[PDB]
Amino acid sequence: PVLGSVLAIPKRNQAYDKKKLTHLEEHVPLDENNITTAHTNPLPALTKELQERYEGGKIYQSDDKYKFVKAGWIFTGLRPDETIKTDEDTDQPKQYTKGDGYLYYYGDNPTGVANYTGHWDFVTDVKRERESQAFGGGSGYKMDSGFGDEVGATSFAEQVFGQYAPRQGNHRAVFKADFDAKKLTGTLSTKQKAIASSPETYVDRYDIDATIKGNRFAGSAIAKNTKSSFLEPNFFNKNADNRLEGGFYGENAEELAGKFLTNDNSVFAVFAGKQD
Amino acid sequence: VLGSVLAIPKRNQAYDKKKLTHLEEHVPLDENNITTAHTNPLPALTKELQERYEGGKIYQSDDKYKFVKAGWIFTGLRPDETIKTDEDTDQPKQYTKGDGYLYYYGDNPTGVANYTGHWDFVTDVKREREAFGGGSGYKMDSGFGDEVGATSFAEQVFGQYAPRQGNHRAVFKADFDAKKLTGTLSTKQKAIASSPETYVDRYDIDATIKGNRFAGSAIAKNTKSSFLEPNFFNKNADNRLEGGFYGENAEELAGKFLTNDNSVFAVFAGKQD
């Protein structure tokens, strides 16, 4: 599914029917048709979008710390305590978390054995109720409130201690490129650290298993847990079997970046890495 | 990729005695105000300031490189001295009198070599950064940082006055084989007469070389600003640093960078050892 780059959106939920005792929307899955493709650096465009739709809104975005490659997010909002309600004089009344965002990956100048290290970001689907006393939100999942049930949960919303706001650098990516065997492996993990005294610990979320062909590579993201319960809730229980794609950018495969979307449209992730 | 570029020091404003708000709180830098130079820009700028500030004394950086220029040039800029207009209207104004420019230029573009030289900078301007946003907590002369963009020449070392020079050190390492360009920019602090001349690293440099030109990142060494540890230099310029080698044998180098949040614009130059 070969690109320069792609781009998606964080999704939102809704509201309640006080006369049929049902919620207007229970589940918002991701849709691979909403994945816009990029033929140039998409950030100008997105920044402009959010500037126009959210006029004096402060924009947060990922740090640009690769040379050829970009991967991350960019958003305004998204403070779930702050809602926007429309159409309450009708039959489909609405209530969406105010603000909007985008997840992206892009590369400029596409292209033995080499090793890469970098990062990944993600946005999940959104469900009011995920595990069952029930929730689908942001504490059982170590997410900020509202993330997972009102907005799609995100990297920057996953909680590490003493970091606030949109967070960064808590999602590690590691890659091994065998250009001889034509294989591309690696692991994406998350930094957990509970309190001040706590060690910075890492939990593996996804292994990677891709075939390389040209400057491009494609294959699978494999979930390391596959188990979600009420006491062990987990956004990351499904693979993206044959649903991961990416490429090497730089004249000597100096960097790499790509994306994958899970089997049940439950996690969309982007990743980037660069040599050691 | 340029021969050279050029920007301006920015200014703030004034107060609304009837809605209890300041007319302007924040003046960020704008990369669109960065004029490009295809020739030595100093004639032009000197002429500008000569015309707009008629009998105004002009201060400028010392010309101590052979092919390369980098520094500033200004009239004013004494914050005690203001200029107010349009007070009979709704957007009344009050700007620090005078104007200036920061520049870098090179004439005659172009193993492993080492360079040493200097850098200069101008910051954005905010009334309130940490309250203050000014010039003492920041070791700047008064008004620099809150009324005018703070500058190299306004950063205080002891027993130097006026526009100051030689307190901002630049060091570079050029690996033409690995195609890499590294280095560090530091500032000389010296508190009182007895005090040692000490240096604090503000920025590391990390650029790729391609042709006579190089481009990459400026990395902030601190990244922390507080009320008791205020810091103009807490943001990188990730992939926002550019420059080149001038001279027939890469004898010199010069360039610029502008930070991620448009908070510091810096120019730098160096020459071999």
Side-chain angles (χ1 to χ4, degrees):
Chain A
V2 26
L3 274 339
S5 35
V6 270
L7 193 152
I9 1 180
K11 295 142 302 158
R12 280 112 112 260
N13 222 27
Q14 224 192 294
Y16 185 74
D17 193 314
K18 303 182 207 174
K19 207 59 222 137
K20 288 201 153 39
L21 279 356
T22 174
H23 296 265
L24 273 286
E25 197 169 40
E26 294 273 8
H27 182 43
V28 189
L30 288 125
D31 194 9
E32 68 161 279
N33 294 14
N34 285 329
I35 302 182
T36 117
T37 287
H39 315 274
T40 157
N41 185 20
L43 276 124
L46 305 167
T47 313
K48 190 204 162 84
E49 271 257 336
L50 302 159
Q51 268 170 343
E52 255 124 45
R53 316 213 255 111
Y54 296 100
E55 177 197 308
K58 167 89 168 106
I59 288 152
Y60 303 87
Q61 46 180 303
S62 284
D63 281 18
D64 196 8
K65 268 156 177 173
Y66 300 78
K67 169 148 211 97
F68 300 89
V69 138
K70 324 208 165 218
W73 43 260
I74 169 168
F75 74 96
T76 340
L78 278 147
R79 281 175 298 284
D81 53 310
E82 212 166 337
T83 17
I84 283 192
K85 37 170 241 180
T86 359
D87 298 342
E88 313 227 304
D89 66 333
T90 105
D91 255 23
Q92 307 284 110
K94 292 149 190 81
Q95 184 168 345
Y96 286 86
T97 277
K98 171 182 183 186
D100 266 309
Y102 288 92
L103 253 97
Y104 61 86
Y105 106 77
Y106 172 67
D108 262 318
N109 327 130
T111 298
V113 172
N115 280 359
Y116 299 79
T117 161
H119 80 295
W120 63 294
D121 288 286
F122 69 92
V123 60
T124 74
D125 59 354
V126 22
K127 304 197 48 184
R128 211 232 333 168
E129 272 192 3
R130 287 183 194 264
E131 287 299 331
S132 200
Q133 269 298 287
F135 64 103
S139 278
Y141 285 93
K142 313 309 166 194
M143 287 284 168
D144 289 291
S145 262
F147 280 85
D149 42 4
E150 303 175 350
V151 197
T154 56
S155 2
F156 66 77
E158 203 162 9
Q159 306 185 322
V160 197
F161 177 84
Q163 306 192 49
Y164 314 89
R167 308 173 175 84
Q168 287 190 57
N170 312 294
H171 305 83
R172 179 171 223 244
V174 130
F175 309 92
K176 180 120 93 47
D178 194 342
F179 303 111
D180 297 345
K182 257 80 87 81
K183 286 293 291 179
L184 194 265
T185 18
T187 309
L188 327 169
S189 13
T190 304
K191 147 163 49 151
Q192 335 242 129
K193 166 196 175 73
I195 62 183
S197 3
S198 288
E200 276 184 11
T201 239
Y202 279 83
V203 37
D204 295 344
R205 301 286 200 203
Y206 292 97
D207 267 331
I208 310 199
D209 184 31
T211 289
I212 299 180
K213 183 182 179 300
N215 41 312
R216 284 274 127 187
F217 57 86
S220 307
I222 294 108
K224 304 291 287 175
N225 210 316
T226 67
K227 177 244 176 56
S228 163
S229 74
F230 181 88
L231 302 146
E232 315 232 13
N234 191 336
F235 283 136
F236 322 100
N237 47 335
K238 303 305 184 196
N239 298 0
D241 300 293
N242 278 308
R243 295 161 67 85
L244 173 142
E245 83 91 29
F248 303 102
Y249 310 82
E251 204 168 30
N252 311 75
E254 290 105 310
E255 293 177 354
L256 74 85
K259 55 135 188 306
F260 70 74
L261 172 72
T262 50
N263 289 347
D264 61 340
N265 311 304
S266 51
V267 170
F268 174 79
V270 298
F271 54 88
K274 98 198 157 195
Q275 279 181 54
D276 318 20
Chain B
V1 24
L2 274 339
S4 35
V5 269
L6 193 152
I8 1 181
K10 294 142 303 158
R11 279 113 112 259
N12 222 29
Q13 225 191 294
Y15 184 75
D16 193 313
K17 302 183 206 173
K18 207 59 222 137
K19 287 200 154 40
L20 279 357
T21 174
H22 296 266
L23 273 287
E24 199 168 38
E25 293 274 8
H26 183 42
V27 187
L29 288 125
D30 194 8
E31 69 161 279
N32 293 15
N33 287 328
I34 301 180
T35 118
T36 289
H38 314 275
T39 155
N40 186 18
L42 275 123
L45 305 168
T46 313
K47 191 205 161 83
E48 271 258 337
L49 301 159
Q50 265 169 346
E51 255 124 46
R52 317 214 254 109
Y53 297 99
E54 178 197 309
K57 166 90 167 107
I58 290 151
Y59 302 87
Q60 45 180 305
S61 283
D62 282 19
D63 197 8
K64 267 155 176 174
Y65 300 79
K66 170 149 212 96
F67 300 90
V68 137
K69 323 210 165 218
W72 42 260
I73 169 169
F74 74 96
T75 341
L77 276 147
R78 280 175 299 284
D80 52 309
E81 211 164 337
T82 16
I83 284 191
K84 38 169 240 182
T85 0
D86 298 340
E87 312 227 305
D88 66 331
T89 105
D90 256 22
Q91 306 286 109
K93 291 149 192 80
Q94 184 169 345
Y95 286 86
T96 278
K97 170 180 185 188
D99 266 309
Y101 288 92
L102 253 98
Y103 62 86
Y104 105 77
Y105 172 67
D107 262 319
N108 327 131
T110 299
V112 172
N114 280 359
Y115 299 77
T116 160
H118 80 296
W119 62 293
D120 289 285
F121 68 91
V122 58
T123 74
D124 59 354
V125 22
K126 306 196 48 181
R127 212 229 335 167
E128 273 192 2
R129 288 184 193 263
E130 289 300 330
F132 64 102
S136 278
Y138 286 92
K139 312 309 167 193
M140 287 286 169
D141 290 292
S142 262
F144 278 85
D146 42 5
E147 300 175 351
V148 196
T151 56
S152 0
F153 66 77
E155 203 162 10
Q156 305 185 321
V157 196
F158 177 84
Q160 305 193 50
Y161 315 89
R164 310 173 175 81
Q165 288 189 57
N167 312 293
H168 305 83
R169 179 170 223 243
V171 130
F172 309 92
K173 179 121 94 48
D175 194 343
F176 304 111
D177 297 345
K179 258 80 88 80
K180 286 294 290 178
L181 194 265
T182 17
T184 309
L185 327 170
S186 14
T187 303
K188 147 164 49 156
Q189 335 241 129
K190 166 195 175 71
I192 62 183
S194 3
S195 289
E197 276 186 7
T198 237
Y199 278 82
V200 38
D201 295 345
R202 300 286 199 203
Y203 292 96
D204 267 331
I205 310 198
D206 184 32
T208 289
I209 301 180
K210 183 182 179 303
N212 41 313
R213 284 273 128 188
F214 57 85
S217 307
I219 293 108
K221 304 291 290 173
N222 212 315
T223 65
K224 178 244 175 57
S225 164
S226 74
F227 181 89
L228 303 146
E229 316 231 14
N231 191 309
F232 283 136
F233 322 100
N234 47 334
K235 303 304 185 196
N236 298 359
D238 300 294
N239 278 308
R240 294 162 68 86
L241 173 140
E242 83 90 29
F245 302 101
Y246 310 83
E248 203 169 29
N249 311 76
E251 290 106 310
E252 293 176 355
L253 74 86
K256 54 137 187 306
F257 70 74
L258 173 73
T259 48
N260 289 348
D261 61 339
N262 311 301
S263 52
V264 170
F265 174 79
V267 298
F268 54 88
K271 98 197 157 193
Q272 277 181 55
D273 318 20

mmCIF file of all heavy atoms in Angstrom, chain B residues 48-62:
data_model
loop_
_atom_site.group_PDB
_atom_site.id
_atom_site.type_symbol
_atom_site.label_atom_id
_atom_site.label_comp_id
_atom_site.label_asym_id
_atom_site.label_seq_id
_atom_site.Cartn_x
_atom_site.Cartn_y
_atom_site.Cartn_z
ATOM 1 N N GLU B 48 19.576 52.853 5.275
ATOM 2 C CA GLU B 48 18.262 52.817 5.906
ATOM 3 C C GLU B 48 18.236 53.628 7.201
ATOM 4 O O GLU B 48 17.455 54.574 7.356
ATOM 5 C CB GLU B 48 17.874 51.365 6.211
ATOM 6 C CG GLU B 48 17.145 50.645 5.087
ATOM 7 C CD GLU B 48 15.655 50.557 5.339
ATOM 8 O OE1 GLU B 48 15.249 50.633 6.520
ATOM 9 O OE2 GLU B 48 14.891 50.413 4.362
ATOM 10 N N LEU B 49 19.095 53.247 8.137
ATOM 11 C CA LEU B 49 19.105 53.887 9.443
ATOM 12 C C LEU B 49 19.518 55.356 9.342
ATOM 13 O O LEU B 49 19.075 56.183 10.136
ATOM 14 C CB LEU B 49 19.999 53.103 10.408
ATOM 15 C CG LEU B 49 19.548 51.645 10.599
ATOM 16 C CD1 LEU B 49 20.679 50.754 11.133
ATOM 17 C CD2 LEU B 49 18.302 51.553 11.487
ATOM 18 N N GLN B 50 20.354 55.675 8.358
ATOM 19 C CA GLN B 50 20.764 57.057 8.126
ATOM 20 C C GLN B 50 19.576 57.907 7.693
ATOM 21 O O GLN B 50 19.465 59.081 8.060
ATOM 22 C CB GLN B 50 21.869 57.120 7.067
ATOM 23 C CG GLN B 50 23.275 57.147 7.638
ATOM 24 C CD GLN B 50 24.342 56.942 6.580
ATOM 25 O OE1 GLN B 50 24.050 56.528 5.456
ATOM 26 N NE2 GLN B 50 25.590 57.232 6.935
ATOM 27 N N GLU B 51 18.687 57.306 6.909
ATOM 28 C CA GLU B 51 17.527 58.018 6.388
ATOM 29 C C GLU B 51 16.403 58.140 7.422
ATOM 30 O O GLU B 51 15.761 59.190 7.531
ATOM 31 C CB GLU B 51 17.008 57.336 5.115
ATOM 32 C CG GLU B 51 17.342 58.084 3.826
ATOM 33 C CD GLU B 51 18.108 57.240 2.812
ATOM 34 O OE1 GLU B 51 17.712 56.078 2.568
ATOM 35 O OE2 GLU B 51 19.107 57.747 2.252
ATOM 36 N N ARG B 52 16.170 57.073 8.183
ATOM 37 C CA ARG B 52 15.031 57.026 9.105
ATOM 38 C C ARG B 52 15.359 57.622 10.465
ATOM 39 O O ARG B 52 14.473 58.064 11.198
ATOM 40 C CB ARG B 52 14.546 55.585 9.293
ATOM 41 C CG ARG B 52 14.477 54.796 8.008
ATOM 42 C CD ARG B 52 13.328 53.817 8.025
ATOM 43 N NE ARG B 52 13.758 52.436 8.209
ATOM 44 C CZ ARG B 52 13.567 51.732 9.320
ATOM 45 N NH1 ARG B 52 12.958 52.274 10.365
ATOM 46 N NH2 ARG B 52 13.985 50.477 9.385
ATOM 47 N N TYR B 53 16.639 57.607 10.806
ATOM 48 C CA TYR B 53 17.101 58.140 12.080
ATOM 49 C C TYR B 53 18.251 59.098 11.783
ATOM 50 O O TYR B 53 19.427 58.766 11.919
ATOM 51 C CB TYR B 53 17.487 57.002 13.034
ATOM 52 C CG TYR B 53 16.309 56.106 13.402
ATOM 53 C CD1 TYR B 53 16.099 54.892 12.757
ATOM 54 C CD2 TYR B 53 15.408 56.480 14.386
ATOM 55 C CE1 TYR B 53 15.025 54.073 13.090
ATOM 56 C CE2 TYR B 53 14.331 55.669 14.728
ATOM 57 C CZ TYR B 53 14.142 54.468 14.080
ATOM 58 O OH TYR B 53 13.063 53.672 14.430
ATOM 59 N N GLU B 54 17.867 60.294 11.358
ATOM 60 C CA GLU B 54 18.733 61.225 10.646
ATOM 61 C C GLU B 54 20.134 61.439 11.222
ATOM 62 O O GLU B 54 21.127 61.119 10.567
ATOM 63 C CB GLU B 54 18.023 62.569 10.501
ATOM 64 C CG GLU B 54 18.854 63.643 9.809
ATOM 65 C CD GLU B 54 18.306 65.026 10.051
ATOM 66 O OE1 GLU B 54 17.094 65.222 9.821
ATOM 67 O OE2 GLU B 54 19.083 65.905 10.479
ATOM 68 N N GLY B 55 20.225 62.017 12.415
ATOM 69 C CA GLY B 55 21.521 62.298 13.011
ATOM 70 C C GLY B 55 21.850 61.262 14.065
ATOM 71 O O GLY B 55 22.530 61.555 15.049
ATOM 72 N N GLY B 56 21.352 60.047 13.860
ATOM 73 C CA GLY B 56 21.521 58.984 14.831
ATOM 74 C C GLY B 56 22.845 58.263 14.665
ATOM 75 O O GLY B 56 23.228 57.904 13.546
ATOM 76 N N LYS B 57 23.543 58.057 15.781
ATOM 77 C CA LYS B 57 24.799 57.317 15.786
ATOM 78 C C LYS B 57 24.522 55.832 15.574
ATOM 79 O O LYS B 57 23.663 55.247 16.238
ATOM 80 C CB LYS B 57 25.564 57.551 17.096
ATOM 81 C CG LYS B 57 26.725 56.585 17.358
ATOM 82 C CD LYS B 57 28.056 57.081 16.784
ATOM 83 C CE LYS B 57 29.254 56.277 17.330
ATOM 84 N NZ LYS B 57 29.869 55.334 16.347
ATOM 85 N N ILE B 58 25.248 55.236 14.631
ATOM 86 C CA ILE B 58 25.066 53.832 14.272
ATOM 87 C C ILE B 58 26.140 52.920 14.878
ATOM 88 O O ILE B 58 27.345 53.150 14.704
ATOM 89 C CB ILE B 58 25.055 53.660 12.742
ATOM 90 C CG1 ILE B 58 23.773 54.256 12.157
ATOM 91 C CG2 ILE B 58 25.192 52.189 12.368
ATOM 92 C CD1 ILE B 58 23.911 54.765 10.740
ATOM 93 N N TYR B 59 25.698 51.883 15.585
ATOM 94 C CA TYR B 59 26.617 50.891 16.132
ATOM 95 C C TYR B 59 26.497 49.589 15.356
ATOM 96 O O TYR B 59 25.396 49.173 14.982
ATOM 97 C CB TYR B 59 26.337 50.649 17.616
ATOM 98 C CG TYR B 59 26.427 51.893 18.468
ATOM 99 C CD1 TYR B 59 25.327 52.726 18.636
ATOM 100 C CD2 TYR B 59 27.609 52.237 19.105
ATOM 101 C CE1 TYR B 59 25.404 53.869 19.414
ATOM 102 C CE2 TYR B 59 27.695 53.380 19.891
ATOM 103 C CZ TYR B 59 26.589 54.190 20.039
ATOM 104 O OH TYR B 59 26.669 55.324 20.814
ATOM 105 N N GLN B 60 27.632 48.942 15.122
ATOM 106 C CA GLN B 60 27.651 47.733 14.318
ATOM 107 C C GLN B 60 28.789 46.818 14.737
ATOM 108 O O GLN B 60 29.752 47.257 15.376
ATOM 109 C CB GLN B 60 27.785 48.092 12.840
ATOM 110 C CG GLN B 60 28.838 49.145 12.566
ATOM 111 C CD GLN B 60 28.947 49.484 11.097
ATOM 112 O OE1 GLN B 60 29.152 48.604 10.259
ATOM 113 N NE2 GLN B 60 28.810 50.768 10.773
ATOM 114 N N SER B 61 28.676 45.547 14.363
ATOM 115 C CA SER B 61 29.670 44.549 14.725
ATOM 116 C C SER B 61 31.009 44.817 14.036
ATOM 117 O O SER B 61 31.048 45.390 12.945
ATOM 118 C CB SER B 61 29.156 43.149 14.382
ATOM 119 O OG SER B 61 28.214 42.695 15.342
ATOM 120 N N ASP B 62 32.099 44.413 14.684
ATOM 121 C CA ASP B 62 33.433 44.553 14.107
ATOM 122 C C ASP B 62 33.645 43.580 12.951
ATOM 123 O O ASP B 62 33.276 42.405 13.038
ATOM 124 C CB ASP B 62 34.511 44.356 15.180
ATOM 125 C CG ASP B 62 34.694 45.583 16.053
ATOM 126 O OD1 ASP B 62 33.780 46.438 16.077
ATOM 127 O OD2 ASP B 62 35.749 45.694 16.716
#
